Design an enzyme around this catalytic site. Structure first.
Site, short mmCIF file in Angstrom:
data_model
loop_
_atom_site.label_atom_id
_atom_site.label_comp_id
_atom_site.label_asym_id
_atom_site.label_seq_id
_atom_site.Cartn_x
_atom_site.Cartn_y
_atom_site.Cartn_z
N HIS A 41 23.17 52.85 55.57
CA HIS A 41 21.74 52.64 55.75
C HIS A 41 21.25 53.10 57.14
O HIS A 41 20.05 53.00 57.40
CB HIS A 41 21.28 51.20 55.42
CG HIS A 41 21.70 50.14 56.40
ND1 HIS A 41 22.64 49.18 56.05
CD2 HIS A 41 21.26 49.89 57.65
CE1 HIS A 41 22.75 48.39 57.11
NE2 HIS A 41 21.94 48.78 58.10
N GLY A 143 20.13 45.39 64.55
CA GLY A 143 20.92 46.19 65.49
C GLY A 143 22.40 45.86 65.43
O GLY A 143 23.22 46.66 65.89
N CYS A 145 24.25 45.65 62.69
CA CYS A 145 24.88 46.37 61.58
C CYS A 145 25.92 47.35 62.11
O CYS A 145 25.71 48.01 63.14
CB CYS A 145 23.84 47.06 60.71
SG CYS A 145 22.59 45.94 60.03
C1 L3I Z 1 17.82 42.20 60.36
C2 L3I Z 1 19.31 41.95 60.24
C3 L3I Z 1 19.89 40.82 60.79
C4 L3I Z 1 21.22 40.56 60.58
N1 L3I Z 1 22.03 41.37 59.88
C5 L3I Z 1 21.49 42.49 59.38
C6 L3I Z 1 20.14 42.82 59.51
N2 L3I Z 1 19.59 43.94 58.85
C7 L3I Z 1 19.31 43.98 57.53
O1 L3I Z 1 19.58 43.07 56.76
C8 L3I Z 1 18.57 45.24 57.02
C9 L3I Z 1 18.89 46.48 57.87
C10 L3I Z 1 17.06 44.95 57.16
C11 L3I Z 1 18.98 45.50 55.56
C12 L3I Z 1 18.11 45.25 54.50
C13 L3I Z 1 18.53 45.40 53.19
C14 L3I Z 1 19.82 45.83 52.91
C15 L3I Z 1 20.66 46.12 53.97
CL1 L3I Z 1 22.23 46.81 53.65
C16 L3I Z 1 20.27 45.94 55.28
#
Ligand code: L3I
Ligand code: L3I
Lengths: 304, 304
Positions: A41, A143, A145
């Site tokens: 992603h 951030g 990820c």
């Molecule tokens: C914001 C955040 C906080 C903690 N861990 C991760 C995140 N990020 C996410 O979840 C996002 C980037 C928005 C997302 C959305 C949908 C699917 C996937 Cl794979 C990832």
């Protein structure tokens, strides 16, 4: 001598963290040999996340669109490919800090350390368990990820997790280092609810043995139970059913303390039915399940 | 996004750990520049520990009696001296892995990470607080002496603790990196009881703010209190008295959540008087006090 939720020393993993940027998105990558691993992603904008066609999005990207920075030095990207939910960026330089490593896909109930990172820089380290519902209860912000989970054996790092997503409930989902999600989760901004999360019974018992080893013995009783009797109680309290494989792994702890596994099950049964009555066990007021029998042996013996 | 008892990444400290041996005793040392720091009881046998005259014991020791091993390489000792309860071994080689560092003597209620080591090798990392009674509730076995506590700011490691002793109660005592013990403890095998350990009120409040930031809001109520009213409750429950300096440090958390500090005190007052009624806060059934307001801001903002 004390008992703490200990994480592995994170040094070997810190030397692998890089920042990966694609267009407007910045996340963490893992640099091992001449390959940088990161969540796929990274090629999406928040607009794409609703329903992304990763194959079509990756087609509009070239090697030069992926910016990989290790500390302050820029890595040259000479290849890119998608494996499941991870991107593999071939760089022209092998990481000189690459430790001996393996990619492992852990089982639910197993534990691992997480090195939370932002912009390719480490912020902290904590111990996690892969929940029976394949989520992890971590601490991750936007951030984070690409931050990874791992275990260490002597000098070998076994990477088991890469962080990808926060579910609407605040729990976390991610993949192994082949990009396969743990559980049914997809890398899409869709409602995905984590199923019923049960307590890891074998880990609670291992932690009860750790409590006895460190002086906390108030919960020991004059009773015993059977696997079938104990499992009737475990079902009632959303505990994983205990099996003979679980009894077998608790053998070293039963041997060291002299408390038969089924006698420890009877203590757990009474704690489940009666509660703690305002008391604590190893500084906790609830039954801890994020320590495996291996973790307890390791911490109680001083394995480095 | 979750809240975990996070430790600092331990890499910079792992590269400083060495094994120090003197006669029959082996413990950990900290190699920074051309100096190795370790507990002075490395010169004692268990027989000497009852009532050791460290000055007289150190007189029978020469540079060649201290064996320092960094991984598999032997360091050459060209000087030795005792500073309070630590020995400083001058070696002929500066540690090439020495990070930017400081020696700091932390205040009770402050937190730090511990890298537990055995034979100069790291086993794990966990987050600790210096208790108001100047003990730490760690996880240490024989051989762990010389393991250090530290904090990190950008690239600078502030070493604050060196592990020396396990008290008969299972809690731990040690020194700052100048060899001065935290608390009244002496490096002698004598009965030394830790005084009354109170709860770090400002840290519990900081953790309550972290709970609100992450969705756990069941404990918020329609009440307020005053510092004098709250402190009458804090005394009854062996909580540190809350001061205006404590209110001042909670300012950023009060600003972010919109919950006035005295309103959060009233939630804590009701939790103290009524208990949790079988409920949890951030996965805990007791009031957590090993997170400072600085820790909460750092974890909730993603400081690397
Ligand atoms: C914001 C955040 C906080 C903690 N861990 C991760 C995140 N990020 C996410 O979840 C996002 C980037 C928005 C997302 C959305 C949908 C699917 C996937 Cl794979 C990832
Ligand atoms: C055995 C152990 C376990 C955890 N931490 C430490 C230890 N070790 C000790 O306490 C010993 C070495 C025995 C000791 C005795 C008296 C005073 C001092 Cl400074 C040290």
């Amino acid at each position: 001598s004390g008992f703490r939720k200990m994480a592995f020393p994170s040094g070997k993993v810190e030397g692998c963290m890089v920042q990966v940027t694609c267009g407007t998105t910045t996340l963490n990558g893992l640099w091992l040999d001449d390959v940088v691993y990161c969540p796929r992603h990274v090629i999406c904008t928040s607009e794409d996340m609703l329903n992304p066609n990763y194959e079509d999005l990756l087609i509009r990207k070239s090697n030069h669109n992926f910016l990989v920075q290790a500390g302050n030095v820029q890595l040259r990207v000479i290849g890119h490919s998608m494996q499941n939910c991870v991107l593999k960026l071939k760089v022209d330089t092998a990481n000189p800090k690459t430790p001996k490593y393996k990619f492992v896909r852990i089982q639910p109930g197993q534990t691992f350390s997480v090195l939370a990172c932002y912009n390719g820089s480490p912020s902290g380290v904590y111990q996690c368990a892969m929940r029976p519902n394949f989520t992890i209860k971590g601490s991750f912000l936007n951030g984070s990820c690409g931050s990874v989970g791992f275990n260490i054996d002597y000098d070998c790092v076994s990477f088991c997790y890469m962080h990808h997503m926060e579910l609407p409930t605040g729990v976390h989902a991610g993949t192994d280092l082949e990009g396969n999600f743990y559980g049914p989760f997809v890398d899409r901004q869709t409602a995905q609810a984590a199923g019923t999360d049960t307590t890891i019974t074998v880990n609670v018992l291992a932690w009860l043995y750790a409590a006895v080893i460190n002086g906390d013995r108030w919960f020991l009783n004059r009773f015993t139970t059977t696997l079938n009797d104990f499992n009737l109680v475990a079902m009632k309290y959303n505990y994983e059913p205990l099996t003979q494989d679980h009894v077998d792994i608790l053998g070293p702890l039963s041997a060291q303390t002299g408390i038969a596994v089924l006698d420890m099950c009877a203590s757990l049964k009474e704690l489940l039915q009666n509660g703690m009555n305002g008391r604590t066990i190893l500084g906790s007021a609830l039954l801890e399940d994020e320590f495996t029998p291996f973790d307890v042996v390791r911490q109680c013996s001083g394995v480095t």
